Design a protein around this nucleic acid. Structure first.
Lengths: 121, 82, 85, 80
RNA sequence: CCCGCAGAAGAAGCACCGGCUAACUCCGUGCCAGCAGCCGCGGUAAUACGGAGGGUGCAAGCGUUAAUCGGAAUUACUGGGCGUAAAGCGCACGCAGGCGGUUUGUUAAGUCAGAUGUGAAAUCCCCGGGCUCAACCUGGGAACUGCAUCUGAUACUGGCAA
RNA sequence: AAUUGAAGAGUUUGAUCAUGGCUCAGAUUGAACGCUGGCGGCAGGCCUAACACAUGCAAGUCGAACGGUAACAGGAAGAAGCUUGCUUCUUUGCUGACGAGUGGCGGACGGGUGAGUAAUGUCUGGGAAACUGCCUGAUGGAGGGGGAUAACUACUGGAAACGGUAGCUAAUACCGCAUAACGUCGCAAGACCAAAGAGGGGGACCUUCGGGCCUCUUGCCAUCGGAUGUGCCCAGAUGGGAUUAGCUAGUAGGUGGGGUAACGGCUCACCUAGGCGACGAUCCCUAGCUGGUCUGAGAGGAUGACCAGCCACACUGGAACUGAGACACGGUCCAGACUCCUACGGGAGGCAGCAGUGGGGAAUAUUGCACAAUGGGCGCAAGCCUGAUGCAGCCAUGCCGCGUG
């Protein structure tokens, strides 16, 4: 979300906690927490994951405690912030399976694979 | 059930069957309780083409052992009216 | 369907429902005898024992109690209703 | 009539039970020297009769506890 | 499996040759190329390298490698050593443990003898039988050197007593 | 008849004799590689990745339990070529048989693998506290009712395992009543617990005209036996490391209560503070174990390929259900560290079965035929199934025989 935000990971290849190092898109863009792309580092990883500690790559925010507002005024709030890990250059998901609920605003461009692998949309 | 049956123990194309008492669940050449006798299908001049311990077959039949079709045929061949 | 493993799954489910019903009823009657023992009065304990005993014998006959459980339940609760005095 | 093992008692600190060491004189399989070996058995005691250092005769029975399978000394009714 | 047909007709390689280890000369190379399990060979007459000829083993296989055992008595129970080759604690007192002078009685735990149960079958060994033979299959025995139980002996050991 | 059995040599040194290591000559293999290669017989053939698996098969059976007819056959009131069966109806279960269904038995055997497991395991020897389908012996019962459901019918859930909603029906499905003992509980008196039919043929009688009736076969139930399989206990044996010395509170016993088919800390409450260990407890590494196999003159050393017994596992970690037997290879329910699959919402799968594919490797085979035999499952039987098994294919992989005169 913001810079210096600890985030959980939905995908299996992404391993445990990640922390946002830069909020991509825009000059002084402060808060981007719905389907935006954020640069992360890996602050703690399990050895089963392909990525390791201290690796910088991109992500997309999938679940947020702030919550997205629907057009009718509905607010869908998830407990705990989550992201899905992406490559720096290709911006495609490293993780083979997506865990947890996803929101229907993650439908544009490369995130159809995320919502297809995800259980609940 | 306890069965008195044949167990193939010979070489290739020359079988030698051991007439044996065993549990029905066990393998053909596997665990057995006692060995009654034998039967070689390959014909020869000897009178030991088939040998059976008819006392043991009678003891196990009284105990409840069932007799296979080949063993009943060999018992019909090895009797008083041979 | 034609495979016997599927028909065994159907039969195992139906038999589990039936056996759970009967096992529940006999454990209700046995816990009635134990509750009357904990109350400390002998007449309702003997009436509960006389009501439990044909049920536990019958289900030993049908084949889920295997008759030594019935013997142990009767023996233990006969000892307890006699020690109530 | 019954298999009996005879040995001295090591502890009576157990309640209604004792531990008995049976000493067996076995040949070594390779070196041939008759070496003495000890088997320690937990033995059930009735009325805590066996006190430490006493040679008692023990008899195999049903499992009375975990690690306990042996029983009392001798014939009952105090034969003299 | 038997009979018939044609034609020697369709059917021989691998390793080694200095010693251990059966089998040796010549040509080329000249501490080079290279061999080697060990000793070791090669620096211009190489039975040791590489070819040929000859010979020796084994043969539908032969060498090389890996692994085990033997030789290795080179872990020694059978069956080794410790002055100097490896090895006597620097020395002593000592618990556990190991081992104990002599006589008699008793027990039979070790020991011995006999018997019984078991130690599956197969394998291994012996006497036979069947595949034309062998491999292979198979009858019976022997063995399974073991354990338990019963009876008997009391010389040695152990227990008890004197 | 059945231990008829033991070889050394090269190398330290100028040379010797010792000591001592190294090396060789022998046999062996689940062997590989190089060179070469004719046949047959018998045996053997993933030793690594218990890595991942495309595809086909490896577990079905009984119409002699039952309702029934989805197919295949035999019977036709209806009129026909104006030929009378050379073909057909609202048709029917009426019969043989039989898709699907209920039910029974088997799916716990057989086949695979050696991951775990250094001792809930194996081998040897003893014991009591137990169960045991199918097979067998003895004795006695087998009387009479009820309610439901699948299949089916109609509706219907985006087309998940495919489920729901009403109504109808049968049984050897299910549940009561009687019966009640050589069974269970109890010191006794006493109390209590069982079931089910089907098939084949028939003098007389009565009758739906199917039967009552008489046999025969099989099936049911109870109890006590046998046999077999299994559960449990004890003793001994069962790698290495003491550069692993102290481990253990359900731990050690007792008494009560529960639990199991059964003894038991198996489990709980309370009491006692015990228990194991220098004859190696505990910890770490490694490993299935045996009969056996290789070597050896033996004693030993090594090893557990094939074959046979026992154990353990079935993508990983749990768990129970059914059942005589499982905590279940080709059964269920969860979590996933994996692949396929939308109606993207809604799920399927598990070759360490037989072939075979990828990978790993120095290396290890056919996506073959047959149930003819021997075994197993079901059935009364015919028979059906059987990647057990019998065979064949490939490979000089081993042993053996013959040939190339």
């Amino acid at each position: 979300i913001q810079e210096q935000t600890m985030l959980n990971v939905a995908d299996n290849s992404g391993a445990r906690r990640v922390m946002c190092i830069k909020v991509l898109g825009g000059s002084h863009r402060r808060y981007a927490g719905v389907g935006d792309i954020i640069k992360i580092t890996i602050k703690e990883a399990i050895p089963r994951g392909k990525v390791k500690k201290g690796d910088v790559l991109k992500a997309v925010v999938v679940r947020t405690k702030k919550g997205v507002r629907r057009p009718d005024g509905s607010v869908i709030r998830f407990d705990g912030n989550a992201c899905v890990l992406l490559n720096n250059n290709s911006e495609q998901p490293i993780g083979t399976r997506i865990f947890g609920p996803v929101t229907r605003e993650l439908r544009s461009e490369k995130f159809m694979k995320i919502i297809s692998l995800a259980p609940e949309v | 059930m306890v069965t008195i049956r044949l167990a193939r123990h010979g070489a290739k194309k020359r079988p030698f069957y051991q007439v044996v008492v065993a549990d029905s669940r066990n393998a053909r050449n596997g665990r057995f309780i006692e060995r009654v006798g034998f039967f070689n299908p390959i014909a020869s001049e000897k009178e030991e083409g088939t040998r059976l311990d008819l006392d043991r077959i009678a003891h196990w039949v009284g105990q409840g052992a069932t007799i296979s079709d080949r063993v009943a045929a060999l018992i019909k061949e090895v009797n008083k009216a041979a | 369907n034609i495979k016997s493993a599927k028909k065994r799954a159907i039969q195992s489910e139906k038999a589990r429902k039936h056996n759970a019903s009967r096992r529940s009823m006999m454990r209700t009657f046995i816990k009635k005898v134990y509750a009357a023992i904990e109350a400390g009065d002998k007449a309702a304990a003997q009436k509960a024992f006389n009501e439990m005993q044909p049920i536990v014998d019958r289900q030993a006959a049908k084949g889920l109690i295997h008759k030594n459980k019935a013997a142990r339940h009767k023996a233990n609760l006969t000892a307890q209703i006699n020690k109530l005095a | 009539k019954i298999r009996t093992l005879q040995g001295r008692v090591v502890s009576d600190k157990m309640e209604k039970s004792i531990v008995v060491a049976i000493e067996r004189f076995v040949k070594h399989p390779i070196y041939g020297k008759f070496i003495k070996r000890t088997t320690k058995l937990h033995v059930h005691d009735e009325n805590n009769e066996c006190g430490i250092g006493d040679v008692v005769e023990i008899r195999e029975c049903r499992p009375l506890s975990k690690t306990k399978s042996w029983t009392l000394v001798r014939v009952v009714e105090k034969a003299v």
